[PDB]
């Protein structure tokens, strides 16, 4: 009865990973994750995958989809949604205690894999272009 659909979120980039209990497929938008294309930030999207190992993926297919945001925002949503779909799937279908090792490895590496970042772009105030800047001021 395995079926999860778990997400992750960044500035505006929202990423949703829906899973089957297949064998080894992990794609992004139909394209393999092996090709994610900030091609220096191709380590980041793999970080959950390499922290856990494929052995924790030999029974799942992740057709993860990402919409909105920017570019690095999307990388940072994919990381989050892979991590959060993994922990949701283990917690509901492997075991709570067996999921504990996964969360403690991830939160050991960092905490931002699993928990979204509350930071957003804050509105710009009249009297100067900039959220916190102002026009240059002249006295004479």
């Amino acid at each position: 009865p395995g079926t999860v659909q778990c997400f992750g979120r960044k500035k505006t980039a929202v990423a949703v990973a829906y899973c089957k209990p297949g064998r080894g497929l992990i794609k992004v938008n139909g394209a393999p994750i092996e090709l994610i294309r900030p091609e220096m930030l191709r380590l980041k999207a793999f970080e959950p995958i390499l922290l856990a190992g494929r052995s924790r993926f030999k029974d799942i297919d992740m057709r993860i989809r990402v919409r909105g945001g920017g570019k690095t925002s999307q990388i940072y949503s994919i990381r989050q949604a892979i991590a959060k779909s993994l922990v949701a799937y283990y917690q509901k279908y492997v075991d709570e205690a067996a999921k504990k090792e996964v969360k403690e490895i991830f939160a050991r590496y960092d905490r931002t894999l699993l928990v979204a970042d509350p930071r957003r772009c804050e509105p710009k105030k009249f009297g100067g272009r900039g959220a916190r800047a102002r026009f240059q001021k002249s006295y004479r």
Partner: protein, 193 residues
């Protein structure tokens, strides 16, 4: 300890050993926690004080790389330059290029400086000591400025300018902008001692 984590999956952090027990706190190279695969992270640093002594040394330098306006706001180019530099450090010395980075950060840090103190009612400058965290701050800033003005209007590229400066600084020679400015700040403070 357990460290199957190599930045860019080729450059092993294990066997990293900083002589300065002063900066063993302020360099993020030793304990299991500061290791990351890539010097780019969406960190919520700067929210609280001293939080940056925990930022990875390579990421923290990468942040110092993206400077002078045309180059503010592009960390991807910065990590790219770090990779090319970081490769060619190995491609010259055949030792842990991380050791080269960290030993250069150590060796390019002033130990005494001159502030503008006054006492008992009158002010005129006096020399003081350097807290190790601003030691490290200024080493990062000053190595990076050395590389940048070595690369300005020069066909030679930034990755390799920065590699040249890290290699000869961690060597300890007085061929780096970084160590030259270090030594002059130190001798001015020694003057105003």
């Amino acid at each position: 300890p357990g460290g199957d984590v190599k930045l860019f999956n080729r450059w092993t952090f294990e066997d990293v050993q900083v002589s300065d027990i002063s900066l063993n706190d302020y360099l993020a190279v030793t304990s299991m926690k500061h290791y990351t695969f890539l010097p780019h992270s969406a960190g919520r640093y700067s929210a609280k004080r001293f939080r940056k002594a925990q930022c990875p040394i390579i990421e923290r330098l990468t942040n110092s790389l993206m400077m002078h306006g045309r180059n503010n706001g592009k960390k991807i180019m910065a990590v790219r330059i770090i990779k090319h530099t970081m490769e060619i450090i190995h491609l010259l010395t055949d030792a842990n290029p991380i050791q080269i980075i960290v030993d250069a950060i150590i060796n390019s840090g002033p130990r005494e400086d001159a502030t503008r103190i006054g006492s008992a009612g009158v002010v005129r400058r006096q020399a003081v000591d350097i807290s190790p965290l601003r030691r490290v701050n200024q080493a990062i800033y000053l190595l990076t400025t050395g590389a940048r003005e070595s690369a300005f209007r020069n066909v030679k590229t930034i990755a390799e300018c920065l590699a040249d400066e890290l290699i000869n600084a961690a060597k300890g020679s007085s061929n780096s902008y970084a160590i030259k400015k270090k030594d002059e700040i130190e001798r001015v403070a020694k003057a105003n001692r």
